[PDB]
Amino acid sequence: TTALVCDNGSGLVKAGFAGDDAPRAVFPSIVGRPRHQGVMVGMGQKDSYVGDEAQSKRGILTLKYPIEHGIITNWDDMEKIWHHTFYNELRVAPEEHPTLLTEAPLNPKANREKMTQIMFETFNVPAMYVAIQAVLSLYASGRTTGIVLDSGDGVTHNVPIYEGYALPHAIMRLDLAGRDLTDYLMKILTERGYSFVTTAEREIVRDIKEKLCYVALDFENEMATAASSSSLEKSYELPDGQVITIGNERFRCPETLFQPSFIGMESAGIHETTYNSIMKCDIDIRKDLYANNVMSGGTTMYPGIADRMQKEITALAPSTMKIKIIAPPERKYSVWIGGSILASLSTFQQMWITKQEYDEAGPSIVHRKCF
C-alpha cells in the first residue's frame, strides 16, 4: 500500500503519505499537562494535551518535550506523540501501512532498540525502517553526492556522502540547535527587561526567533551598525497586546551556531565542523563536497545563513576550488520530501525491516539491516 513517512524530529513532527511533496501533518512535539486546579465538572478536558491542542491552550499547561538532543527521554510521552500522529491527525491504521522513520547519527543504540520495539509491538506495522536524516536530505536535492549540514531542533550534524555512500568516520554531531538558541534568546531578552520563565513563554520566544532573527553576514559590522543607529530594531506584538522591540538580539542569537562560546560549550562552530568533516575524508573525493553543500533542518531557515556559510567555508578552504551552498527554499521538509521520494521506489521494497524478521532476530536487526 501507500507508505508513511514520519520524521519525528526534536521540535516538530512531520508525518505524511509517500509520493507527495507537501507533508500533511506538521505539528510540534510537546505534551501539555495541566498544573492549576480545575473547577468545571463534565470532563471533556484531558489530563494531557498533545500537539496543536497543547499549543492553543498553552497558558495553563506545563509543556514537556519528549526528545532532547535527538534522544527520547520520556518514552510514554513519545508514545503519546506517535498515537496522536497516527490515530488522531493522520487517521490511518498502522498495521496496514509501511512507515519509514528518521534518526540522528551517533545516537545511543538502545534508543534505536526501544524505537524498534515500540514500533513493532505497540503500534505494530507490517514494515518499517530507520534511516539517517542527512541521507534523505540529500535525496530531496536530486543528487547522489554531497555533504549535508542538518541542523534540527536538538542535533546539528555534519555527514558527507560520496556517490551515495556515507563515510561514518567523518560524521560529526554537535549538541547546538534551535532549542539552545531559544534558551540563549530567553537569556539575553532579560537585558531589555522582558522576563520569560515559563514553558509557555518558550514558544513565544521561539516565535520571535522564527519571525525576526537572522544571521549576520559580518558580526562586528552588525555590532557597529546596531550600536550606531536603531535601523535594525524591530517590534513584535505579544499575545497579551504588549509590543516589545529587539535590536542586536536578532543576530546575537543565531551567532551561537558560529560562536558556541556564548553558551559556554568549548567546541567550535558549524563551519569548522563542516571543514573538519571534509578533511576527515580523503583528498581526491573533496571535489564534489565543496560543490554540494546541501543544508537542511529548520534552523537553516534564517535568511542570511547561506552567504555566511559560503564566506566562512571560502575563508577556511583552499581557494583553488568551487564553493557552492545549495540551499533549496523547501529545506525544512527536505527530510520528509526525501522520504517520500525514497519510499515510492520498487528497489526499496526488498529492504524493509518486517515483523517476522524481527521475530527471529530480536529487536537488534536494526543495528544490522539498517546502516
Binding site: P126, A127, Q350, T354, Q356, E357
Partner: peptide, 10 residues
C-alpha cells in the same frame, strides 16, 4: 527465501 515468504505474506 524468508524474504520472499515475507513479501508474499505482506
Amino acid at each position: 527465501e524468508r524474504r520472499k515468504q515475507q513479501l508474499a505474506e505482506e
